[PDB]
Design a protein around this nucleic acid. Structure first.
Ligand code: ZN
Length: 667
RNA sequence: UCCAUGCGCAUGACG
RNA sequence: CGUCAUGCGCAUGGA
């Protein structure tokens, strides 16, 4: 409930109008200052006795929880109403009531936006920006094209212009709230010049309709006292491959596949995908099946260039073991093909000796063990530990690996995000909290993490941040995590990877240059530029809405037939399908049901083809074992258009399918 | 607390 | 515009 001196001056303009931005580094505790702005605004509104609301917005739920528990309540526990609002907190009360109540709100973004849309539709109780007297944001540097919450500012922008027009038109003018923006260093997006960066910043500011940035320069001394920045550091340090590449070449010869590129990169992957579409556009075999296999192989390569090939053997053991299980489940109610037999036998004839090759070291892994061991010695104990990388699979893999070799012990644990993707077992927010807490105790010495740890997770006191094969903001936040107590950054990758840390330093210089330029600017010219950017953004939104509205026009019941994509085989019609939840599609009418096969290895079985292809899940809804499917695995056959099409999702086409009627299923 | 799914978004790399 | 990897949020349904 007190102001630092450097916080004082920067907060100063916001206290009277001054919709502004703030950027300060980690550790400066910009929540306290924000709270002071809140309390001062509220006290002002009590002095005028008017509606004082704050609608604080974030990108993630965790920060809302943190600030509710620890920042907003303990300083406004006494006076005012507070509530921490999230998509996950099943809350009995609805949003516009906690607008009707709850002078202070902490919230995640799209709650608000959804409520505004319910307004614009008029569906459920609505809300508008007129119910407010202030807005505060965290992480404004996400404010850009089609951001989660940036859309709302465009409405604030749209109505704003109306106000000015109304002042010209009739001159009644509705109020609009003050806007505060907080962030770390905003960074910069896709620049090589100061002008590009400056245009970015002006874009941000007029997307926030701000007035200035108001960074700290006077009281830099106490800041640098609180803020100790660690040392910018760079620390940099067979036949199985060809054994497999020969197989790949044999497979091209088997398939007449001309790569027009090398093995072990994205271009070969993309060519494989395009060929797989075309052979899906042709309904042939040995042409798309092998595109998929070769996709798997190139994945195996690009891990082999970075990972112990034992993990590639794991990958392919998983794959082909599933393949054998698929073909056996097909045979259970039935035989192979020359294609499948060729590929499988080509694999299995080598599989054992290839696993033998896997057990032969002759690699960045050695450099990694060296980099790990050296820090354990210098610390001699009580060494915190962080690792970054790209993927999820890498983390499980390396954790399993490090469990096996040495350890002197630093028990380390993996970490990933949450998303339902990658064909992996994700983690859970609870589990993330558990892990970071154990690290907070230091019981877990080393963390293996993707780019979650850099983002917004409370970590500190650490020293040995690294990079095994990985923008300026990620860099500065990872530097913020490791403190200036014998802490050293490390980067390890085959080698422009140094280029990127260098670029981050370069952008760190450039952003300060642009900040200094814009701050020292005419208020007139500044306002003119920001108005132009606001008009540009608004017209851009109108064009996007025009294109989207013009997009979907057909909305047909049944114009198609869905087919197997390995075998150009009829599977379903357009009218035989039905819908549940207005989300999922399904095919009853057991004429269909005579076709498929079912499998389940470990809560819902999976539906697979007579060719062997995997098509869906035994979705159990309302007591019906609804065989749901995924359009990703299916191909389109219009009666009208000969060309085949494939979408990866239902909403690509506009043509609608009906909602299911269980009264049909009256037995 | 766990699980399945849909939708939207940003970021990095690649064409 | 297309691909991949990563991350985020929201909405459903179930235990
Ligand atoms: Zn089939």
């Amino acid at each position: 409930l007190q102001l630092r001196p450097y916080q004082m001056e920067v907060a100063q303009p916001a206290l009277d109008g001054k919709n502004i931005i703030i950027c300060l580094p980690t550790g400066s505790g910009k929540t306290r200052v924000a709270v002071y702005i809140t309390k001062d605004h509220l006290d002002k509104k009590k002095q005028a006795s008017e509606s004082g609301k704050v609608i604080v917005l974030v990108n993630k739920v965790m920060l809302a929880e943190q600030l509710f528990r620890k920042e907003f309540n303990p300083y406004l526990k006494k006076w005012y109403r507070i509530i921490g609002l999230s998509g996950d907190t099943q809350l009995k009360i609805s949003f516009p009531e906690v607008v009707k109540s709850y002078d202070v709100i902490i919230s995640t973004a799209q709650i608000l936006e959804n409520s505004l849309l319910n307004l614009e539709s008029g569906d459920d109780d609505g809300v508008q920006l007129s119910d407010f007297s202030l807005i505060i944001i965290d992480e404004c540097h996400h404010t850009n094209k089609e951001a989660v919450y940036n859309n709302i500012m465009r409405r604030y922008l749209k109505q704003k212009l109306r106000n000015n027009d109304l002042k010209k038109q009739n001159k009644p003018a509705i109020p609009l709230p003050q806007i505060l923006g907080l962030t770390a260093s905003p960074g910069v997006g896709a620049a090589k010049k100061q002008s590009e960066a400056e245009k970015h910043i002006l874009n941000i500011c007029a997307n926030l309709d701000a007035f200035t940035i108001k960074t700290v320069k006077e009281n830099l001394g106490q800041l640098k006292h609180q803020i100790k920045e660690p040392c910018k550091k760079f620390v940099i340090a067979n036949p199985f491959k060809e054994k497999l590449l020969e197989i790949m070449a044999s497979i091209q010869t088997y398939c007449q596949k001309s790569p027009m590129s090398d093995f072990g990169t994205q271009h070969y992957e993309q060519w494989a995908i395009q060929m797989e579409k075309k052979a899906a556009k042709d309904g042939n075999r040995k042409d798309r099946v092998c595109a998929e296999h070769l996709r798997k192989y190139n994945e195996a390569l690009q891990i082999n260039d970075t990972i112990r090939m034992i993990d590639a053997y794991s990958h392919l053991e998983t794959f082909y073991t599933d393949e054998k299980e698929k073909k056996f489940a097909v045979l259970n109610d039935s035989k192979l093909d020359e294609t499948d037999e060729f590929l499988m036998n080509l694999f299995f004839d080598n599989k054992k000796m290839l696993k033998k090759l896997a057990e032969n070291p002759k690699e960045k892994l050695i450099k990694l063990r060296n980099t790990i061991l050296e820090q354990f010695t210098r610390s001699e104990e009580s060494s915190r530990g962080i690792i970054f990388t790209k993927t999820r699979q890498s983390t499980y893999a390396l954790s399993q690996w490090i469990m096996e070799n040495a350890k002197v012990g630093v028990k380390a644990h993996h970490l990933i995000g949450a998303g339902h993707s990658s064909e992996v077992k994700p983690m859970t927010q609870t589990e993330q909290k558990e892990v970071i807490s154990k690290f907070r105790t230091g019981e877990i010495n080393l963390l293996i993490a993707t780019t979650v740890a850099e983002e917004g997770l409370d970590i500190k006191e650490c020293n040995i941040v690294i990079r095994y094969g990985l923008n300026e903001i990620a860099m500065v936040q990872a530097r913020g995590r490791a403190r200036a107590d014998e802490s050293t950054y490390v980067l390890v990758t085959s080698s422009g990877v140094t280029e990127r840390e260098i670029v981050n330093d370069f952008r760190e210089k450039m952003m300060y240059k642009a900040i200094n330029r814009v701050q020292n600017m005419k208020p007139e010219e500044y306002a003119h530029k920001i108005l132009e950017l606001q008009v540009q953004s608004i017209l851009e939104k109108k064009m996007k809405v025009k294109r989207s509205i013009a997009k979907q026009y057909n909305d047909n019941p049944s114009l198609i037939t869905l087919l197997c994509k390995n075998c150009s085989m009829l599977v379903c019609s357009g009218e035989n399908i039905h819908v549940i939840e207005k989300m999922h599609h399904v095919n009853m009418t057991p004429e269909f049901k005579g076709l498929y096969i079912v499998r389940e290895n470990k809560t819902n079985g999976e539906i697979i083809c007579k060719c062997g292809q995997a098509w869906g899940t035994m979705m159990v809804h309302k007591g019906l074992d609804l065989p749901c499917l995924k359009i990703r695995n299916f191909v389109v056959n219009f009666k009208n258009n000969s060309p085949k099409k494939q979408y990866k999702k239902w909403v690509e086409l506009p043509i609608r399918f009906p909602d299911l009627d269980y009264s049909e299923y009256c037995l």
